[PDB]
Amino acid sequence: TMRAVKRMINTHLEHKRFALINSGNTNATAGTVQNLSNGIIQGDDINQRSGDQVRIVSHKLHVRGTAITVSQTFRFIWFRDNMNRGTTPTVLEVLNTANFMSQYNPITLQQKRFTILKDVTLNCSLTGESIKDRIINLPGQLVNYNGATAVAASNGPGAIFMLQIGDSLVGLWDSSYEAVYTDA
Amino acid sequence: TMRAVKRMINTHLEHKRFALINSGNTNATAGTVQNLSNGIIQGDDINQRSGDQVRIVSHKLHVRGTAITVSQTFRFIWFRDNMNRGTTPTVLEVLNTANFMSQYNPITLQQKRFTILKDVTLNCSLTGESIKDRIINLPGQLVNYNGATAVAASNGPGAIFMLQIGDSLVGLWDSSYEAVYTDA
Amino acid sequence: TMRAVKRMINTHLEHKRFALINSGNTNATAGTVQNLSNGIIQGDDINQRSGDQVRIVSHKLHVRGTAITVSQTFRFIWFRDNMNRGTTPTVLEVLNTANFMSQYNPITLQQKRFTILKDVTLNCSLTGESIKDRIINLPGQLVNYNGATAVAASNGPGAIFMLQIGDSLVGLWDSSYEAVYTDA
Amino acid sequence: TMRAVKRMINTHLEHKRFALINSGNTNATAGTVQNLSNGIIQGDDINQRSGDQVRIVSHKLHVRGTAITVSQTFRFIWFRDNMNRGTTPTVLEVLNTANFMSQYNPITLQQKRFTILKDVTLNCSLTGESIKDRIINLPGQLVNYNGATAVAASNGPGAIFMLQIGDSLVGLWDSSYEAVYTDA
Amino acid sequence: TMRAVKRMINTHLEHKRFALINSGNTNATAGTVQNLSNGIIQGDDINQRSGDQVRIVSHKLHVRGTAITVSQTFRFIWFRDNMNRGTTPTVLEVLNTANFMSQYNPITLQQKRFTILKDVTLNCSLTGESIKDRIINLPGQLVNYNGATAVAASNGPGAIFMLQIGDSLVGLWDSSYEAVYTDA
Amino acid sequence: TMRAVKRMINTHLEHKRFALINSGNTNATAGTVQNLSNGIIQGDDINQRSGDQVRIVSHKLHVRGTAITVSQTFRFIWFRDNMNRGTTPTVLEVLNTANFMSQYNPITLQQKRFTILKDVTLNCSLTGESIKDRIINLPGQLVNYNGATAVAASNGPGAIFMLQIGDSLVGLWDSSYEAVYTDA
Amino acid sequence: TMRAVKRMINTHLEHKRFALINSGNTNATAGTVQNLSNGIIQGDDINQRSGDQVRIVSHKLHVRGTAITVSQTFRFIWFRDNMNRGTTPTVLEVLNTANFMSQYNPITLQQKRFTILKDVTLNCSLTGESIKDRIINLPGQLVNYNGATAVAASNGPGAIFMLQIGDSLVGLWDSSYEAVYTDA
Amino acid sequence: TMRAVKRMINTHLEHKRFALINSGNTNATAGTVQNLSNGIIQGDDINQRSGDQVRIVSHKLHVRGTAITVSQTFRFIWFRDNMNRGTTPTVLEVLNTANFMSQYNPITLQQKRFTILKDVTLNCSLTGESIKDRIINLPGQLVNYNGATAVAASNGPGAIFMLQIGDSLVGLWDSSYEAVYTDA
Amino acid sequence: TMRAVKRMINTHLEHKRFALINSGNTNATAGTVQNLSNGIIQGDDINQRSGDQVRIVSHKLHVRGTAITVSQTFRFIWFRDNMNRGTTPTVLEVLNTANFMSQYNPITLQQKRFTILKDVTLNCSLTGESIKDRIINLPGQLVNYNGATAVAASNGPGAIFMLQIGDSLVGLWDSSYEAVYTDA
Amino acid sequence: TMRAVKRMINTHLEHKRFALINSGNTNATAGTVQNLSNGIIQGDDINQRSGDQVRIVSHKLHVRGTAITVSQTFRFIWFRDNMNRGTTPTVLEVLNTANFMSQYNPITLQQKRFTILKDVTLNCSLTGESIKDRIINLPGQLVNYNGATAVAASNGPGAIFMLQIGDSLVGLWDSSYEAVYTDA
Ligand SMILES: [Ca+2]
Ligand SMILES: [Ca+2]
Ligand SMILES: [Ca+2]
Ligand SMILES: [Ca+2]
Ligand SMILES: [Ca+2]
Ligand SMILES: [Ca+2]
Ligand SMILES: [Ca+2]
Ligand SMILES: [Ca+2]
Ligand SMILES: [Ca+2]
Ligand SMILES: [Ca+2]
Ligand SMILES: [Ca+2]
Ligand SMILES: [Ca+2]
Ligand SMILES: [Ca+2]
Ligand SMILES: [Ca+2]
Ligand SMILES: [Ca+2]
Ligand SMILES: [Ca+2]
């Protein structure tokens, strides 16, 4: 009866929580990669961790894009880095070319360096809907860390990131993230 | 045969009703929390109660947002306060930070101070759809009161509220609420 | 399945509550009869009632006696008046003679005018334990009223009382009572 | 086989322990409320915690009362605050009136703000037994915290307290508490 | 057990990948036909092939249209050429007439020269949403080649193409394609 | 085994095809009725017929509307004339009144003169989406003819038509139709 | 049949006995720890042992307290030292603080250094019962020794002790102990 | 199904790790006792612990001996101290006499003060193999601590040690240790 | 019948082979990491590959150490890098410290960056056996590449390496490797 | 159920222990016979006995030989004397001739005077391994004694001995022995 047991277990483990907000960023045509699970540092508080492992039960991502000056596109790629050794992946590691219309890098998705969680494209128009947002909630996995503080070198296999790329540099995007995890 | 019995029971209890309307309010970037079930005061009429308990069979919420001057966002968070002791919760009790893009306060949602019923975001554009609305109908629960009148001190565990937060202070939002409850 | 049904029913009915305290009374050798359920008057609050009936789910009685000047006895008789027509029963109605060592009145207990809930005797000594108390919790019954206010004429069949009789007039006794009842 | 599994689980979790002693206090006729589980602060020691949750497997309370000058009563009410938001409850929240003979506050026990664990009354006589004590051991529950330090604002839903009220201000009472909890 | 076996087989074959991007093209009222699987040339790299056959496990197509000067329509027809002998099909081979509102050529779809994978129409408005895109993912088939290089003469039966036709010549469209295939 | 047999039968019958396009028409407030299956004339080619009967296996209709000068509505009613005797039905035969908001003619739909296949309404706005289209694919039926050429007198029971009615005379609509039929 | 066999076995082993009395001791506010099983030394008599092991079948403890000058408390903690290496445990090893109202030392009871057999508190009053006693009989266990004589260094794992702590230094306590053990 | 459950449990607990190296030590004819699990101190890192308990899933020991000047013997005794109270055991506690050829101390192994994990003897010859090593991997147990830092007083029941004794004082030995443990 | 099928499959795939020899290397006290599967470059020969994936059916490693000047130790650690992104791992990534007696790096083996295939230690003595060797044969896995040539940047997840570390810099070690793999 | 019973029995009997060490002895070409179980004399301590019988549960023997001046052989014969009448057997009683290469005495092994437990030969070389040792652990038997002290006349049937014979008189051998026995 493996379904039940898994809950008697989880009602004994504390479900710590971590929140993070990243507002008023500009659209990048070359893209940028943001850290989301790196903020969970070693400490004894509710949004911290013990050791170098944590289990995200569920995490939620909220992306918003606002068109300014011109009508543009905003792309948000939520992904898990399965073989991270203490860095923030670059855009050319995930994307074939540093373009918002590009497919994934064939070599890195063949060896499964990354696991694409969600790929969202928002088209903000200055003659229609100039503001668009989207919320995504997903079950989580194991996250390994290589350090105790909130630096790139602390990222480990299972690290959660978000790639942002567009076709303009003038529009603004906002984001928020939340992770519920056990730390037993 | 617990399904049947529950209806023979409910066809004997009077299903009292309460309506409330809250129009022409301005968008708040810091947010505000409105009372919805507090209006049900002690009396012997159809939209009143006897004692300090009532059972909401079903309640409906209607939110509308209108963009003025600028294109903006309107966020409506319908929630139940499970451990209310005679107050109107503040925005920082529900939200991590007083921002419309923010995730929930990790400490208060861990202990389940609140139960989020519905989280609706409406993006009103002055170049597209400047008026948006939304109706939500949900089964209810038990509502406890700590007083007989329509004051904050009368709110109790199970109290129903609505948090409104946006990114402008110039847009207008309207709301209406209805609750069908037994009072046996 | 009459056990279950009885609970689906009771989780729908509001369990109103009434508290009452009666401190610093003197021991009576002739006795006195105190009112306990009479305090529940018509109103729309948590310790009031609708109509002339209520159902006590459970009630608790707390009696305390303190010896002063001499060592004495305190007798507390908690009882239900099953055929009350708007009065406070007298001591000779319950007791055969107005004495603290007396048995019950044979005629009134034969026709079951009363139902003795609890008969407690406390012997307070000024050379031993001069202070004694006792708490008793019991399931309740139906209580009928003949009026809407807290007067003797409002007492009805099922009315709850307490008879106090001792062998001195100098000792002090305290009491408190609580009743949990439905009013559907 | 849910009985077994629950033990294979618990033989893997560390059973941390916390002790506390509160001696030579004076009887209060208005009462006082003492903190018992608040002492468990964030840290990495055996009587500390990680995060804002802990699970008390079992806790024990020891109360002692000594009569001085006069024969008096000592009341100890051990209770769990199920909807605590960062405070030390007051006496009028638990008791109907600030009296040692009083029943519970009808409104707060109807909504189950509190769960009374144990209600002990000790009558110390200066002509009999002037010293009385009592030990109570009970299974525990989940305790939520709202802070990391030992302040009232850190108390959360499941917080354990003790209310002391008497009929004199001259007698002395002592108390000790122990909690065994998991922190996985 | 033909389901299983098909996976033991595929976990032994290398899943090579090919990406391609085609940006800033102008809308054609006469239409144009673009090559998508022709880019997979003979070589020993991850986006190349051995022999003249490959098996596309899955391929994805991304089309975007932007209205410029006028509000217009963009039509994208993703199709497989089942009887290709070394050419890029013309528009009159797929469409009855060189018009964006036209049905398929009755003679060529009767003999099944082509297999229409997806037919997408995007209406870009300069007073509404001027930018629209669409992503389509589909299981693949066998692709035969007639040459080793990326020329039209190398296209073979199973060749994948995309027909673009609109009602203006001023709007811009972008596209990207990805194919995952075995080459055993 | 009537399912199978029906396919062994149909893989023996030639599935002839007919295409037709009708572009740049103006919106009519009184409406117009267009011919769709009348184009299939007697001949020995792929889009012709033998005899006066044909069986449409499936047909597809594509309607497009473009707002010009004013924001308007375009209504398209695809219908089968079951009792046609050699004419193009008028608008008052299908509609109760020659208005785009009107319900069907009660007398002709009671006797089932017509069978409404699809009723599509497109609202083109000059401040939003000014261009809208819609594709509908449906299984067909038997079509009888009363002549050999493409004239109204050749229409017979089962004839397929399209009624177009709007609230302006300035907007433009386009349409295309395709029919796959057997002619055994 | 493991129940029977265990008795055929024990009716073959000699049940040696040891008695000990410790009278007229004074109450200690810091406490003291007394030896109980240490008296069983190597020899060939009825209250001696062979080797460094013995099996206590059952042992009995008798504690008496007498109030002198003031009314006081006497605490007796009968315990087994499971990891003794040749010493008399100190009071701070068993108790958290050297106080008669204190809970057990959290660290030593977590690792199970000790096993509390019985914790008895006697309140002797000079106005009530000034003399109180208590007898406790319990099944025993294995006792290991590290020496042959009656010195602290001879105590081993399973050693039996008694901790005495009070709130006065003037009262007197007496004790007696008996152990029935096998020595096969 | 107790085998499975034990793994669903362990895939939720973080398996912290601790490494330690102790090189260039000289052979002791009287012997020395080294600490191995004492290094795991309270902290929130991967090689630290929370509370005073940990569960070693598996630990590995590596011993190396090098003969210098003369051919000699190196003895390594890996052992668990089951009744440790905050010390580093001495050699005479484990060995009968401080000699490398000696059997275990009869009194301490009878009461099971220690549990010998591994007893390895390496004979290094200067005319043969002068360098010898050995690796041993074993499942672990529960480890209790009495302090938070890396001092002898922090050692508790379950503490892991290594005794080194030889027949020369001139040879050199090296050692390394690793422990994988849960800390839930 | 998944056992059989797996062989019918493998008798169809060509089992390519790669050999490599690395002789006359000096012992390193800081260690070095050698490449073993990197030599398999893109080409169409028997010891080459197509694409960026290969499946090693079985590989064999041969290590030899020769003592020169002094008696020394040679350590060989054969390992698979599961999350390689185009580098040759360093010694501190695998080992806790750059010492031949050291345990593995706790952080990198917790996240399973590496999988230790074999850890061999050879003690070469100049007074005994100065030459020692060892052959190890093991089933293989999937190997991913990030490039087509024999450079560090071509290494991918599944890359096979060998770490060599000793206690002298004067001894010589030799090695050979062979891999049998499919490339379908 | 004779397996179980044998353990319920043995968990009641004290497992006394005896250790003995015999270092720095010279190799004998004529041989010598050493006493091992004779050391267990009558007394009441842990390494003594009661009566003239004991039951060895298990005993362990450790032999070491060191080559000096010349390379030599060391032979160790561990044996039980089943018919001992109060002596130390001579070498010619066990061996056919007083030579280290000799077979057993045919007459004494035919009547089973002795039971050979272990026959170990160690060849110590001064150009190879000059030091060799060996540990042997074996279940025991009944041992009878003929006296109370540690003299040869006290040896009885079941007496344990060790015969040492070599081919040189210059090498040194060491030995240690341990016996675990019951004495019920
Ligand atoms: Ca952790
Ligand atoms: Ca009510
Ligand atoms: Ca009523
Ligand atoms: Ca008295
Ligand atoms: Ca910490
Ligand atoms: Ca916790
Ligand atoms: Ca191929
Ligand atoms: Ca617009
Ligand atoms: Ca026909
Ligand atoms: Ca014994
Ligand atoms: Ca721990
Ligand atoms: Ca040699
Ligand atoms: Ca090639
Ligand atoms: Ca390949
Ligand atoms: Ca003796
Ligand atoms: Ca014996």
UniProtKB/Swiss-Prot annotation, chains A, B, C, D, E, F, G, H, I, J:
Binds 3 Ca(2+) ions per subunit. It is found in: Virion. One of its GO terms (cellular component) is viral capsid. Its main location: virion. Its cofactor is Ca(2+). Gene3D superfamilies: 2.60.120.20. This is Capsid protein. It comes from Satellite tobacco necrosis virus 1.
